[PDB]
Design an enzyme around this catalytic site. Sequence first.
Site, PDB file in Angstrom:
ATOM      1  N   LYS A 214       0.937  -1.118  -0.266  1.00 35.02           N
ATOM      2  CA  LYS A 214       0.183  -0.095  -0.180  1.00 35.02           C
ATOM      3  C   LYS A 214       0.902   1.252   0.020  1.00 35.02           C
ATOM      4  O   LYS A 214       0.391   2.334  -0.174  1.00 35.02           O
ATOM      5  CB  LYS A 214      -0.836   0.161   1.160  1.00 35.02           C
TER       6      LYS A 214
ATOM      7  N   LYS B 250       1.294   4.961  -4.923  1.00 32.60           N
ATOM      8  CA  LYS B 250       1.911   3.872  -5.337  1.00 32.60           C
ATOM      9  C   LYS B 250       2.612   3.839  -6.503  1.00 32.60           C
ATOM     10  O   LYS B 250       3.884   3.415  -6.709  1.00 32.60           O
ATOM     11  CB  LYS B 250       0.828   2.529  -5.359  1.00 32.60           C
TER      12      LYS B 250
ATOM     13  N   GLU C 278      -6.005  -2.359 -10.905  1.00 29.57           N
ATOM     14  CA  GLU C 278      -6.946  -2.299 -11.535  1.00 29.57           C
ATOM     15  C   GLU C 278      -7.652  -0.790 -11.617  1.00 29.57           C
ATOM     16  O   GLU C 278      -8.369  -0.595 -12.446  1.00 29.57           O
ATOM     17  CB  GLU C 278      -7.862  -3.233 -11.565  1.00 29.57           C
TER      18      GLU C 278
HETATM   19  C1  LIG Z   1      -5.791  -7.788 -11.064  1.00 25.73           C
HETATM   20  C2  LIG Z   1      -5.915  -7.103  -9.588  1.00 25.73           C
HETATM   21  C3  LIG Z   1      -6.335  -5.634  -9.421  1.00 25.73           C
HETATM   22  C4  LIG Z   1      -6.165  -5.136  -8.229  1.00 25.73           C
HETATM   23  N1  LIG Z   1      -6.132  -3.898  -7.962  1.00 25.73           N
HETATM   24  C5  LIG Z   1      -5.725  -3.121  -6.689  1.00 25.73           C
HETATM   25  C6  LIG Z   1      -5.695  -1.499  -6.852  1.00 25.73           C
HETATM   26  O1  LIG Z   1      -6.236  -1.030  -7.735  1.00 25.73           O
HETATM   27  N2  LIG Z   1      -5.373  -1.003  -5.691  1.00 25.73           N
HETATM   28  C7  LIG Z   1      -4.877  -1.674  -4.464  1.00 25.73           C
HETATM   29  O2  LIG Z   1      -4.683  -0.940  -3.684  1.00 25.73           O
HETATM   30  N3  LIG Z   1      -4.901  -2.946  -4.409  1.00 25.73           N
HETATM   31  C8  LIG Z   1      -5.216  -3.682  -5.534  1.00 25.73           C
HETATM   32  N4  LIG Z   1      -5.134  -5.245  -5.868  1.00 25.73           N
HETATM   33  C9  LIG Z   1      -4.699  -5.656  -4.741  1.00 25.73           C
HETATM   34  C10 LIG Z   1      -5.822  -6.470  -3.658  1.00 25.73           C
HETATM   35  O3  LIG Z   1      -6.995  -5.995  -3.082  1.00 25.73           O
HETATM   36  C11 LIG Z   1      -5.217  -7.911  -2.908  1.00 25.73           C
HETATM   37  O4  LIG Z   1      -4.951  -8.623  -4.455  1.00 25.73           O
HETATM   38  C12 LIG Z   1      -5.841  -8.847  -2.128  1.00 25.73           C
HETATM   39  O5  LIG Z   1      -6.948  -8.084  -1.289  1.00 25.73           O
HETATM   40  C13 LIG Z   1      -5.359 -10.204  -1.344  1.00 25.73           C
HETATM   41  O6  LIG Z   1      -4.345  -9.618  -0.650  1.00 25.73           O
HETATM   42  P1  LIG Z   1      -2.913  -9.663  -1.058  1.00 25.73           P
HETATM   43  O7  LIG Z   1      -2.389  -9.264  -2.535  1.00 25.73           O
HETATM   44  O8  LIG Z   1      -1.877  -8.671  -0.078  1.00 25.73           O
HETATM   45  O9  LIG Z   1      -2.758 -11.384  -0.908  1.00 25.73           O
HETATM   46  C14 LIG Z   1      -5.675  -5.995  -6.965  1.00 25.73           C
HETATM   47  C15 LIG Z   1      -5.242  -7.388  -7.183  1.00 25.73           C
HETATM   48  C16 LIG Z   1      -5.504  -7.850  -8.526  1.00 25.73           C
HETATM   49  C17 LIG Z   1      -4.875  -9.432  -8.693  1.00 25.73           C
HETATM   50  O1  LIG Z   2      -8.569  -4.481  -4.434  1.00 29.69           O
HETATM   51  C1  LIG Z   2      -8.759  -2.966  -4.624  1.00 29.69           C
HETATM   52  O2  LIG Z   2      -8.284  -2.651  -3.586  1.00 29.69           O
HETATM   53  C2  LIG Z   2      -9.051  -2.693  -5.747  1.00 29.69           C
HETATM   54  C3  LIG Z   2      -9.415  -3.145  -6.834  1.00 29.69           C
HETATM   55  C4  LIG Z   2      -9.885  -2.371  -7.948  1.00 29.69           C
HETATM   56  C5  LIG Z   2      -9.812  -1.082  -8.057  1.00 29.69           C
HETATM   57  N1  LIG Z   2      -9.576  -0.486  -6.779  1.00 29.69           N
HETATM   58  C6  LIG Z   2      -9.299  -1.194  -5.789  1.00 29.69           C
END
Ligand SMILES: Cc1cc2nc3c(=O)[nH]c(=O)nc-3n(C[C@H](O)[C@H](O)[C@H](O)COP(=O)(O)O)c2cc1C
Ligand SMILES: O=C(O)c1cccnc1
Lengths: 216, 216
Positions: free
Chosen positions: B13, B73, B164
């Site tokens: 984060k 980020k 994403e």
């Molecule tokens: C394709 C994809 C898009 C995601 N988007 C974001 C994002 O835009 N911002 C963010 O803070 N985390 C984002 N995440 C991170 C997640 O919420 C996280 O993968 C999930 O809650 C499981 O936690 P971990 O990755 O720490 O194991 C994304 C994960 C994937 C796989």
């Molecule tokens: O997993 C998230 O926190 C997330 C995924 C897509 C867009 N914004 C946040």
Amino acid sequence: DIISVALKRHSTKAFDASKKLTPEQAEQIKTLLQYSPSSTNSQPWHFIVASTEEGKARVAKSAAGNYVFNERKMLDASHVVVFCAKTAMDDVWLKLVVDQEDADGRFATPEAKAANDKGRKFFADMHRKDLHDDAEWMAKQVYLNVGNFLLGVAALGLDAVPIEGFDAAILDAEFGLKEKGYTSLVVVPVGHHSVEDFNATLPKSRLPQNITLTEV
Amino acid sequence: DIISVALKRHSTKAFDASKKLTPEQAEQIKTLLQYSPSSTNSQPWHFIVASTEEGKARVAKSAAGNYVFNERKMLDASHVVVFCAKTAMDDVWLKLVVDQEDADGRFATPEAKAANDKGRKFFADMHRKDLHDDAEWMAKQVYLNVGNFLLGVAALGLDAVPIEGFDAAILDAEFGLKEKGYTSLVVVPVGHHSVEDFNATLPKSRLPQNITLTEV
Ligand SMILES: Cc1cc2nc3c(=O)[nH]c(=O)nc-3n(C[C@H](O)[C@H](O)[C@H](O)COP(=O)(O)O)c2cc1C
Ligand SMILES: O=C(O)c1cccnc1
Ligand SMILES: Cc1cc2nc3c(=O)[nH]c(=O)nc-3n(C[C@@H](O)[C@@H](O)[C@@H](O)COP(=O)(O)O)c2cc1C
Ligand SMILES: O=C(O)c1cccnc1
């Protein structure tokens, strides 16, 4: 080391039916499946892990018609994983997720939990209510899991092969997937390759970075 | 070992802007991007790796607005990878691919090359001509690349976060991707988390296997 794994890893074309995963490896592949990341931690997936002759035979039924050439792989490998995606994002699933995160201790307060739910609820709607592409959105997460799984399995020293050449209509029907809210996308037989795997000694091939990569 | 990597990695984060990848690691993640497997070895992707202050800022523009939480980020990470998928599958690219396997020596005879070219085009036509899911199909392969990349990067001892939450239209425009034949799908900042990364301390959460995995 991990790059070594990535450079030496390959799509097995034939498995040695007598070579199985150790009970430890078998547990590890399930862990890999479970802990893959996903957007908003949606985890819009279900996996079928076939390790018995009867179980594998059912999966292999999907390898007919134009795909019979992938039958041996499903039949001969030690474990065959069927990656499934949900067909629609529902609130009951959204609630299940946030409640697990809560049970796992990710929220210091109920408002923090509500904030998380609203965030997830916001992107879920954007996909289902606005963009109308939630099926694709969740299917993408599953492929990401597949990518994590392929490297993982290779780092465990196991052979595998991602499979798209199979009949999903047959596979889903064989396990009643649609009537459960899922649909199969990729199949991955896992085990040890046999001397019949001509691809184990062929050089790996990828496009040059000057074509696919730009630096700024 | 790789299981530990899977259980320990997390979505970062917050990054420490002073912690840069080593010249070697910066080279390994590109190797990682390049060698991901893909259906038919079609490699329907392009990657933008922003590492200069100006480049990351340009990528960041796509996060201004409703995705501000993802903006930092992108500015603070050492390297920021933008995963893009081809927007349509043309015969020139199929030609480029099969000619690479050839140059790399995967075909022992001309018939082998032709047979491979025939097989690849059969599935490409199935997606573009019959299923019309041409774009979604290549997009899925890109996500598989992402999944491989997230595990790999973590095994390299690097922090990253899949994203994403960004405006693909803005991003696409900043780098003239549309006219180039590509569209951005997910952004992945890579580097080292700072003490500000509240997620580095929270426990990981995933749905129980008794609901997501069936064993047969
Ligand atoms: C394709 C994809 C898009 C995601 N988007 C974001 C994002 O835009 N911002 C963010 O803070 N985390 C984002 N995440 C991170 C997640 O919420 C996280 O993968 C999930 O809650 C499981 O936690 P971990 O990755 O720490 O194991 C994304 C994960 C994937 C796989
Ligand atoms: O997993 C998230 O926190 C997330 C995924 C897509 C867009 N914004 C946040
Ligand atoms: C999603 C996906 C589906 C694919 N399908 C099959 C298949 O049905 N049959 C097969 O023999 N190989 C299949 N492949 C395997 C390879 O064609 C691709 O992984 C290979 O050309 C690039 O090679 P390598 O994996 O050994 O590194 C697929 C790969 C992916 C990623
Ligand atoms: O990569 C392959 O050989 C392949 C991919 C999808 C379907 N059939 C074969």
